[PDB]
Design an enzyme around this catalytic site. Structure first.
Site, PDB file in Angstrom:
ATOM      1  N   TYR A  15      -2.994  -0.516   8.763  1.00 29.64           N
ATOM      2  CA  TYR A  15      -1.938  -0.463   9.363  1.00 29.64           C
ATOM      3  C   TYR A  15      -1.872  -0.275  10.743  1.00 29.64           C
ATOM      4  CZ  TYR A  15      -2.556  -2.639   4.878  1.00 29.64           C
ATOM      5  OH  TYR A  15      -3.006  -3.569   4.039  1.00 29.64           O
ATOM      6  N   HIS A  30     -10.299  -1.699  -7.209  1.00 23.39           N
ATOM      7  CA  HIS A  30      -8.709  -1.565  -8.180  1.00 23.39           C
ATOM      8  C   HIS A  30      -8.281  -2.231  -9.006  1.00 23.39           C
ATOM      9  CE1 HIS A  30      -7.624   0.697  -3.592  1.00 23.39           C
ATOM     10  NE2 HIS A  30      -8.663   0.912  -4.129  1.00 23.39           N
ATOM     11  N   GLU A  69      -9.871  -3.847  -3.005  1.00 23.52           N
ATOM     12  CA  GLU A  69      -8.319  -4.050  -3.918  1.00 23.52           C
ATOM     13  C   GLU A  69      -9.342  -4.906  -4.739  1.00 23.52           C
ATOM     14  OE1 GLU A  69      -5.614  -2.904  -3.696  1.00 23.52           O
ATOM     15  OE2 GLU A  69      -5.636  -2.354  -1.796  1.00 23.52           O
ATOM     16  N   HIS A 115      -6.271   2.553   4.229  1.00 20.70           N
ATOM     17  CA  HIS A 115      -5.261   0.949   3.820  1.00 20.70           C
ATOM     18  C   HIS A 115      -4.146   1.251   4.997  1.00 20.70           C
ATOM     19  CE1 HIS A 115      -6.456  -0.652   0.301  1.00 20.70           C
ATOM     20  NE2 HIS A 115      -7.701   0.119   1.181  1.00 20.70           N
ATOM     21  N   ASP A 128       1.060  -1.168   0.448  1.00 19.25           N
ATOM     22  CA  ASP A 128      -0.010  -0.145  -0.163  1.00 19.25           C
ATOM     23  C   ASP A 128       0.130   1.093   0.420  1.00 19.25           C
ATOM     24  OD1 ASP A 128      -3.082  -1.202  -0.022  1.00 19.25           O
ATOM     25  OD2 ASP A 128      -2.896  -1.720   1.581  1.00 19.25           O
TER      26      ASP A 128
HETATM   27 FE   LIG Z   1      -5.375  -1.316  -4.160  1.00 20.88          FE
END
Ligand SMILES: [Fe+2]
Ligand SMILES: [Fe+2]
Lengths: 320, 320
Positions: free
Chosen positions: B127, B224, B221, B123, B90
């Site tokens: 984390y 994406h 994702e 993202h 990321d």
């Molecule tokens: Fe992504």
């Protein structure tokens, strides 16, 4: 000659305390367990999460009628000029913020820049939804393209691009500080004739749907100015060699030029034909904002004669 | 040699039908009243508004205890490797998406790219919040830096950067298609050993707080991959001269290499010591995903022997 950092630098510094806004030696892993620039991480949180908004959740039931039947020829001319220009400004910003972000070497600052770039995209969406909502399709295409018809608007757009294009063509330290100052001036000043107009229409219960969209955009723009105020002030501390006296002189000239240009746009747009605002209120308003923004990056007031916000009432009207 | 479009092009095409993904002649005003690529504007809306999420609104009350007392040495080793690598992926993405966006000449596609860049930043935030929530500060710094300790992880990071760095150093049409395919492969495959592991821990009621964060990341994702599937397929139609047979061969090789590398990572991370997943399930899973993603950009299955999702149960477990 500012080098764009490689995607991953295994020779990068582990220690967040060694981060620089520019010319750092980062790994380009976003090591966000430690934050050197708390202001950047706070602004990310604010822009990204706290101030999140959905343009299409703002009801647009009234403005098409008031546009159709209640607005003067002068009110419609201003609506068109202001929205055309704001569309241009946020288009330039979504694109230029990618250039700042790829050169920044501090992850929390890159993070804040990404959030700002996303907010500029939300604005572009808001303008498309305002126009789809309020005007007919040929007139919406006309407003998007109004620079093709109006030489003053065309020249405004070309002047804004100039300062950004120089960094892109010639990505050196001088051109970076000038583009950074230009970005701060754009978000400090270039919205504010347009915001003052909309809040004027709105104070008389005209185009209040459009005005709601504007309040969310203005909140975003205050965060954008705060982000660039911190970046400039931090760049002065970290890279003083770049604030040559030639650069310091240039900043004061460009700020004064930009104040004067924004005033003239405001005047051109309104032409003393808009009830509740006049050419002199516009003058003192843009000079008040110029003083505020240039003092906040370490310069003396540029219009010593102006000390008070002539439109103090906006501070309160614009709130959400 | 792909030229980065100037901030404003008064010689730009007015007609949205003349837009190209690359090498168009746009004004670089985001003229969103007309949309050539409806898939890009839909994906902007989905990523930007529909699928908006706040990591810190996900309660993290349980995982610190289960980490402290309930996880094996093997479960903790995997947690650390997977999260270290996802942090790296990321980080690379928030930075590389600025390079794609500045070269794209279609505003609705640039808009979708900006939304994706913002999601990669969300993202990174997730984390930092997972680790602040679950582990002690030195261990969190260790997970961020785990590439300094693990040669397999260091080499994974260096290989991902290679393909992106070549475009950045040498921004030509070939290096752009290779970086575009590399981006598609990263979001197709490089998350999926990590997602499979987390959903395995989660199916046994282990680290379900961390697993909630993962479900939001995985939804992002999938969007994406859909965005890059459309970009690649549109680039084939609009610029066929760039899909030389040398390039088509390279795409199939790189996809096969990436499938094999992801399988080995998955195996390295789990080592048959993780209850409910084994080295052979991992193999068929990454081959299933490779077939799915390479067929969807116009190639024949790369593992004809694999036709079924060995982990069909994830499709349903991951939903929100
Ligand atoms: Fe992504
Ligand atoms: Fe802004």
């Amino acid at each position: 000659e500012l080098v764009r950092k490689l995607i991953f630098n295994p020779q990068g510094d582990r220690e967040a305390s060694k981060r620089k806004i520019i010319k750092g030696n980062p790994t380009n892993i976003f090591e966000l367990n430690e934050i050197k620039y708390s202001w950047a991480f706070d602004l990310y949180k604010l822009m990204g999460f706290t101030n999140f908004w959905i343009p299409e959740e703002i009801q647009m039931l009234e403005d098409r009628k008031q546009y159709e039947t209640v607005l003067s020829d002068y009110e419609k001319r201003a609506y068109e000029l202001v929205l055309s220009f704001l569309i241009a400004l946020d288009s330039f910003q979504v694109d230029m913020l990618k250039e700042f972000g790829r050169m920044i070497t501090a992850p929390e600052v890159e993070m804040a820049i990404t959030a700002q770039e996303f907010q500029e995209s939300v604005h572009a969406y808001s303008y498309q939804f305002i126009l789809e909502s309020v005007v007919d399709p040929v007139k919406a295409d006309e407003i998007y393209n109004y620079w093709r018809e109006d030489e003053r608007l065309l020249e405004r757009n070309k002047v804004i691009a100039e300062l950004y294009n120089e960094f892109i063509r010639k990505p050196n330290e001088e051109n970076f500080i000038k583009a950074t100052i230009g970005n701060y001036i754009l978000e400090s000043l270039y919205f504010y004739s347009g915001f003052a107009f909309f809040y004027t229409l709105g104070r008389q219960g005209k185009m209040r749907n459009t005005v709601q969209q504007i309040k969310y955009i203005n909140r975003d723009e205050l965060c954008h100015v705060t982000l660039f105020r911190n970046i400039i002030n931090t760049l002065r501390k970290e890279n003083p060699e770049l604030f040559t006296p030639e650069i310091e002189k240039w900043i004061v000239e460009y700020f004064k030029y930009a104040v004067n240009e924004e005033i003239k746009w405001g005047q051109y747009v309104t032409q003393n034909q808009i009830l509740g605002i006049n050419d002199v209120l516009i003058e003192r308003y843009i000079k008040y904002l110029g003083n505020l923004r240039i003092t906040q990056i370490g310069f003396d007031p540029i219009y010593p004669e102006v000390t008070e916000n002539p439109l103090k009432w906006i501070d309160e009207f614009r709130k959400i």
